[PDB]
From a paper:
The mycobacterial repressor, DarR, a TetR family regulator (TFR), was the first transcription regulator shown to bind c-di-AMP. Recently, DarR, a 201 residue, TFR regulator of a putative MDR transporter, Ms5347, in Mycobacteria was discovered and represents the focus of this work. Structures of TFR proteins reveal that they share a two-domain architecture with an N-terminal DNA-binding domain and a C-terminal inducer binding/dimerization domain. The DarR N-terminal domain consists of helices 1-3 and the dimer domain is comprised of helices α4-α9.
The M. baixiangningiae DarR structure was solved by selenomethionine single wavelength anomalous diffraction (SAD) and refined to final Rwork/Rfree values of 18.5%/20.2% to 1.6 Å. This structure was then used to determine the M. smegmatis DarR structure. While the M. smegmatis and M. baixiangningiae DarR structures have essentially the same overall folds, the distances between their DNA-binding recognition helices differ (as measured by the distance between the two centrally located Tyr47 residues on each recognition helix). In M. baixiangningiae DarR the helices are separated by 50 Å while the distance between these helices of the M. smegmatis dimer is 41 Å. Analyses of the electron density in binding pockets in the M. smegmatis DarR structure showed water molecules. But there was no evident density for a ligand.
Numbering used by the authors:
A (entry chain B): 5 to 204
B (entry chain A): 6 to 109, 115 to 204
């Protein structure tokens, strides 16, 4: 279809919003990375910003589907959280472009020079932000009640967990370029350190 | 302790963090510093070279804070948590400088980059000071037999990550921050699941 020609734009922007950043990237930069005119780019997206919201949209959606299915597993909460976290990681190791461009907005928060339709849309994705972290909070108390899990502040570890989770995109920047199997091994081992602990 | 160079450094580190480095300029720096337009330029070559100063200044600060906590006569688990607590208190109280120590496309000169290489060594050594502690920590049986490079790496970025949900929370007293960084450490190293 033409979903073929739009995703190329959003993949390109996802990988161009990263090295340069939004404020330091223009439509043309996308046009050059994609090898396409600047007219059709504006044909599919009415704004230099609207494009970013779409890569945002896809970034959650893509993760939104991938990690949700582990909302029920074989073990207690501990065993539920490990697999879903492993997904979130391997996801972000190949979805990397779309995932840097879902937490970037914090750098554009204060200025917030924006249209009034984009204010509603972006916030609509902000309250949708809360959904994903709540999903990760829920699988926690399932193991805490079972005792197979340690116990710590539920308003802290979720912040600490998601943060420790996405903290790895500030060290995988010059590490990309391997097999998706080799990404899964790390996604497993790292969730081990963050979950099963580094002490005895 | 009103000092001119340092106040220029904080105004920069502040703007450098919240305002994008790209979209935070010397003029942008001037408005929050209350200094003359060319005053900044008197001691600092260019926007970048302030970054060198601010990076270097707040970089060696954290190292002084945490080093005393690597030379204790204890185990890997308890000293590493000790150092990581100082890491977080540095981060929570020095958030502008601390984020800018790993915040670096522009037309850069070799000399301003040579210092950047010098800075990067400091960053690679503070972290290695964290790697050595874990090396004993699993050599002494108080820590899981976990891959060394990754465990030190994960913890370190785990501490540097407490900034992005903390930049909108920083108003509390040091009594709170010391009581906070400790919990932020426990599930960082101890983990969970019994």
């Amino acid at each position: 279809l033409e979903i073929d020609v739009k995703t190329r734009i959003l993949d390109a922007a996802a990988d161009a919003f990263m090295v340069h950043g939004f404020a330091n990237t223009t439509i043309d930069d996308i046009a050059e990375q994609v090898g396409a005119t600047k007219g059709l780019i504006y044909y599919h997206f009415r704004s230099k910003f609207d494009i970013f919201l779409a890569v945002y949209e896809d970034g959650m959606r893509r993760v939104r589907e991938r990690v949700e299915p582990h909302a029920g597993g074989a073990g207690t909460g501990r065993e539920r959280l490990v697999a879903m976290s492993v997904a979130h990681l391997e996801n972000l190791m190949t979805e990397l472009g779309y995932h840097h461009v879902v937490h970037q907005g914090v750098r554009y928060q204060a200025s917030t020079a924006l249209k009034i339709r984009q204010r509603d849309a972006l916030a609509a994705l902000n309250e949708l932000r809360r959904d994903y972290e709540l999903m990760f909070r829920r699988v926690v108390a399932e193991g805490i009640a079972d005792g197979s899990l340690r116990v710590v502040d539920e308003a802290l570890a979720t912040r600490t967990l998601l943060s420790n989770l996405n903290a790895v995109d500030m060290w995988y920047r010059r590490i990309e370029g391997q097999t998706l199997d080799e990404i899964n091994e790390l996604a497993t081992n790292v969730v081990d350190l963050l979950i099963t602990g580094m002490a005895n």
